[PDB]
Design a protein around this ligand. Structure first.
Ligand code: QMP
Ligand code: QMP
Ligand code: CO
Ligand code: CO
Ligand code: CO
Ligand code: CO
Lengths: 327, 327
């Protein structure tokens, strides 16, 4: 009923339309403070983020969950500033993604548990801002360290009730390995979202996880490099599957009785330094709507395909509410 | 005429006895701010660092060059606080070591040149504290990215006059490849220190580089894991060669007429998170003197072996002053 946001505790009824997997900035630990000029300036990044979230709010969005971890360069002070200026609730994250520095990668499962617990129970850095979600990641078969992160995430979740959201290489069916590891720790499937699931057309994989109680993250609907096959870097990241094909997976899962298991988002950002230099400009040209892509283009598309507004309201309001609530 | 420290510009004479390769904290970008409890607390680390530097000061040290780069988790505000309370000048560093995150590893030579220049000319983060040295690294044959860092370092040094200091896998003769890359950029050998040179006994390698005008960094004299062969992690880090063996390389270069090419240090720290958890405790047990090891143990050892006082004063005061001075 009460979740932690970057502005403090709010009631779950106030969350409303929620985008479950977003980023204010896709960067690296300490990078934004050390080289803000990469993004023009910190002020330019703040202004871009505020304009984007205000446009998303005008379109219907009330809350975004920033799944940026320590290693994605999460700066909660930036999240707080943007949240207040745009009047959009932002849920901060803990956990580790696939670029942890030596000081993180050499740690034991017990040490990582205390770090994730510190960020949820005490606060992130010296801000007092508490995390409301744990972000973990695997890119194919889990490395010994990634297995420790998954276990530590599960132990932190059981102690606080806070949910776990994942990054997967969906074509490699990573969700199954993640699921098995979470369940070996006693974590309930209802507290986990298997993300980047829209990167695959394998419905047998998605429905099986959904049947076990897992939340399915169809979280990168506008990600498409169709038309830009000459740009090798944009093709490798955005993929060659259309926004429509990704959006039709939402309909496919509703039609198989799993409307309560779907979580939708854009996996968008306002700053991107962890890849090639031109990537943010390339991405903004592909999708000028940004985070507003879900209520402006995806919801009307699904209404046109036959999905009722009540089901779409259930996926964007009711589902994230149940997922984010500490249980 | 003036060297930039964490407390502002100082004259050449104010530098005095200088330790050319040290660290206040050996960590990772953003780590100290995100998990200060790893070091007990930030207050505990500051207090330990201030005591250790005051110990070094009473023994003769007036300046240390903290070669902690962005990726070693350099926190210039921590450096400034410790410097003020201990009354020991600290020269901060720019550059990149062997743990760059995605946002750094994906950058071009031009972009990295602008980052290093920003840290020398403008300042580090939002502190206004300017770096007075560029730290780079290779661990065997240079990787494509490490070659870009060395080139960017050379271009940054040529525009500012600030020197370059390196980390080497000395047994692999890395200094020769580093030298070839620096010289191809038009960088003068007198502006470069080939560090970790005390990790090898190959005198023909050290003398050839010294004859070419390079400064030889015999920078980790107390590093020895003799007596603790049971500790796999400490053995792989510190090595099996004695401090005496490392210190006899200073005498060996003085005997072959390269007194002017020697830079001595401890490569010590007060906090260490980029390795195994108990490493700082193990290191403090091996060498309780810390940064005071050079004037308390190495200087009297060399005095007993036949090296005169004016020669040792030349290595510890004159050589660093000439190296650090922007030329
Ligand atoms: C490879 P991944 O989909 O995690 O990349 C993310 C893209 C959005 C910013 C954070 C990184
Ligand atoms: C031999 P290496 O430079 O990796 O070890 C250092 C120890 C002090 C902190 C920075 C790292
Ligand atoms: Co991801
Ligand atoms: Co993401
Ligand atoms: Co080193
Ligand atoms: Co060092």
């Amino acid at each position: 009923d009460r979740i932690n946001t970057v502005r403090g505790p709010i009631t779950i009824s106030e969350a409303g339309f929620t985008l479950t997997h977003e980023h204010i900035c896709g960067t690296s630990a300490g990078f934004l403070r050390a080289w803000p000029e990469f993004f023009g300036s910190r002020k330019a990044l703040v202004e871009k983020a505020v304009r984007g979230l205000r446009r998303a709010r005008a379109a219907g969005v009330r809350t975004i969950v920033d799944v940026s971890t320590f290693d994605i360069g999460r700066d909660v002070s930036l999240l707080a500033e943007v949240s207040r200026a745009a009047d959009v609730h932002i849920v901060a994250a803990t956990g580790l993604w696939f670029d942890p520095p030596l000081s993180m990668r050499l740690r034991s499962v017990e040490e990582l548990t205390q770090f994730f617990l510190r960020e949820i129970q005490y606060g992130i850095e010296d801000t007092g801002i508490r995390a409301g979600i744990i972000k973990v990641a695997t890119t194919g078969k889990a490395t010994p360290f990634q297995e420790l992160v998954l276990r530590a995430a599960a132990r932190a979740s059981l102690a606080t009730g806070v949910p776990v959201t994942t990054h997967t290489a969906a074509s490699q069916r990573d969700g199954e390995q993640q699921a098995a590891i979470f369940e070996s720790e006693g974590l309930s499937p209802s507290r986990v979202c298997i993300g980047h699931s829209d990167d695959t057309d394998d419905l047998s994989y998605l429905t099986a996880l959904a049947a076990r109680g897992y939340l399915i993250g169809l979280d990168g609907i506008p990600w498409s490099a169709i038309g830009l096959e000459d740009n090798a870097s944009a093709s490798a990241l955005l993929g060659n599957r259309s926004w429509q094909t990704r959006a039709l997976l939402i309909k496919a899962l509703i039609d198989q009785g799993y409307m309560k298991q779907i979580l939708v988002s854009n996996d968008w950002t306002f700053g991107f330094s962890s890849y090639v230099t031109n990537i943010m400009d390339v991405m903004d040209r592909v999708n000028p709507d940004g985070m507003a892509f879900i209520p402006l283009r995806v919801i009307p598309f699904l209404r046109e395909k036959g999905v009722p507004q009540e089901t779409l309201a259930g996926i964007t309001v009711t589902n994230p509410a149940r997922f984010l609530s500490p249980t």
